[PDB]
Design a protein around this ligand. Structure first.
Ligand SMILES: Cc1ncc(COP(=O)(O)O)c(CN)c1O
Ligand SMILES: [K+]
Ligand code: NA
Length: 431
């Protein structure tokens, strides 16, 4: 059972707490779309772990490649190259949009945003970075300085030149022009304020194509293209953080392919390592050449390590071979219709949004007031777990609690239906 007194005593005595509370269970095994507690109880993993298990837990082909490289080619001096590294780098150049040619293989998402941000500052000779007011890019220095949904207080000054603009949010619009939500005019208004505050050192704008921690906020039609033009006019680079949206989760290989807008630097992580610590940035040949002439440095212990790279290549091989980008649309649509069915039954569901298998459900007290419910939101999440469904709700000021639903891309029809059923039962008993 989950009550092991010795486990919990050691946990309380020896763990640094880092946000949230720990779930009251001991996970002993994981397979496919499920994790199992000490009693052997199956829990449907509707968040793919910490949004990384795109192939589900312990996929046989990942188990296979891991064992193979762990026993043959593992870690190396960082100036030594190997085939998994050049192959993965090449595959990323071939599957990302034209204009993205060279890759750097790292370990974590924050680390990949750090590498991108440093490169932008170096090639522009400038340092101000602009992000969204509801963003999340990581816990490390520069990634945290551009993170506005949380973490800015009690820890001293942010990086010099940190600015934010509001994200375009169609469910809670606050910028009206001629009776309607003019998010493009909101963008122009925001950039004029940025321009006046700036010291003339704008280096880049960093953006999630769908803000996850921020409440599953999807950038609307024409917005990303207009953002890119704001950057081009100011000699700024556009960096797109696809930690959560990359590698097929939203129904295209990369979310930026939907708008057809190619960023100057693309960052990847979670979904690329499928559970393992692998991350990357990809940029153009012109930007990389200039960064190299200027002495670009990002030398770490695990950059270009063969085992992590072999795993990422295998992840891509499987996603491509098994058509998992298409499955995200088929299972994504099945899940979204089920969520809309629940919305028909329960007045507390104020909105169902997102794309592919990155969906959000916002809980509200009043559908006309859109007044947040959240106390209710946490309750539903609690009931879901009791029922064997792992969910995650995010809460930001002026918004209802929002469930972030992101099942493995390998999830089955039966699994989607089980999740939908448990959710409905959780809402019924939370009310
Ligand atoms: C969009 C986004 N970017 C970057 C990160 C940071 O990744 P990591 O925690 O692996 O450093 C996160 C957190 N999952 C994220 O959601
Ligand atoms: K290395
Ligand atoms: Na490319």
């Amino acid at each position: 059972l989950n009550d092991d007194a010795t486990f919990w005593r050691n946990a309380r005595h020896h763990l640094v707490r880092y946000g949230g509370t720990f779930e009251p269970m001991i996970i002993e095994r994981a397979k496919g779309s499920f994790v199992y507690d000490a009693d052997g109880r199956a829990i449907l993993d509707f968040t793919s772990g910490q949004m990384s298990a795109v192939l589900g837990h312990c996929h046989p082909e990942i188990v296979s490649v891991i064992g193979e490289y762990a026993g043959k080619l593992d870690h190396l001096f960082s100036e030594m190259l190997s085939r998994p590294v050049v192959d993965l780098a090449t595959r990323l150049a071939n599957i990302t949009p034209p204009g993205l040619d060279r890759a750097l293989l790292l370990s974590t998402g924050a680390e990949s945003n750090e590498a991108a941000i440093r490169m932008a500052k170096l090639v522009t000779g400038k340092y101000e970075i602009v992000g969204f007011a509801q963003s999340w890019h990581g816990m490390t220095g520069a990634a945290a300085s551009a993170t506005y949904s949380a973490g800015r207080k009690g820890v001293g000054p942010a990086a010099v030149g940190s600015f934010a603009i509001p994200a375009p949010f169609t469910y809670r619009p606050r910028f009206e022009r001629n009776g309607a939500y003019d998010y493009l005019a909101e963008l122009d208004y925001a950039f004029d304020l940025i321009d006046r505050q700036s010291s003339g050192n704008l280096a880049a704008f960093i953006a999630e194509p769908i803000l996850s921690s921020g409440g599953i906020i999807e950038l609307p039609d024409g917005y990303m293209a207009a953002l890119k033009r704001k950057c081009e006019a100011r000699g700024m680079l556009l960096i797109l953080d696809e930690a959560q949206t990359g590698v097929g989760r939203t129904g295209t290989m990369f979310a930026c392919q939907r708008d057809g807008v190619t960023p100057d630097i693309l960052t990847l992580s979670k979904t690329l390592g499928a559970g393992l610590p692998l991350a990357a940035i990809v940029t153009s040949a012109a930007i990389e050449e200039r960064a190299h002439e200027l002495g670009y440095l990002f030398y770490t212990t695990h950059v270009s390590d063969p085992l992590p790279a072999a795993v990422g290549l295998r992840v891509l091989d499987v996603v491509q071979r098994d058509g998992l980008v298409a499955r995200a649309n088929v299972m994504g649509d099945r899940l979204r219709r089920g969520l809309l069915d629940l919305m028909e039954r329960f007045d507390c569901i104020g909105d169902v949004r997102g794309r592919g298998l990155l969906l959000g459900v916002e809980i509200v007290k009043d559908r006309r007031t859109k007044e947040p419910a959240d106390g209710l939101g946490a309750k539903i999440t609690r009931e879901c777990m009791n029922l064997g469904l792992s969910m995650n709700i995010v809460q930001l000021p002026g918004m209802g609690g929002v469930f972030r639903i992101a099942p493995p891309l390998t999830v089955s029809e039966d699994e989607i239906d089980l999740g939908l059923s448990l959710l409905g039962q959780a809402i019924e008993r939370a009310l």
